[PDB]
Amino acid sequence: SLTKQYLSVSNSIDETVARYKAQFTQLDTMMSKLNNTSSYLTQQFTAMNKS
């Protein structure tokens, strides 16, 4: 009953932790994309201004 409730709450908590971490992972992938794009945009500006 009590250690049982612990089993249940541990399980539920674990589900929640996986959820949070997964959200963070996807968000960071989006970050990767945008960072790369903006970085090459920046180099292009620097060169074409050096022009």
């Binding site: 992938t29 990767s32 994309k33 790369n36």
Partner: protein
């Protein structure tokens, strides 16, 4: 014997730039996610299977 009214040469470079950039974007998305089927856009049959 050329034209200031348009830098067709730069226009020519630009499209190649965008094409390469799109290829890179897809590649980096796949390599970061670790899954190639990130959306139905990639493989209709694969996603449903």
């Amino acid at each position: 014997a050329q034209v200031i009214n348009t830098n067709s040469l730069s226009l020519l470079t630009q499209n190649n730039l965008n094409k390469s950039q799109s290829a890179l974007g897809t590649a980096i998305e796949r390599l970061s996610s670790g899954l190639r089927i990130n959306s139905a856009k990639d493989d209709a049959a694969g996603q449903a299977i």
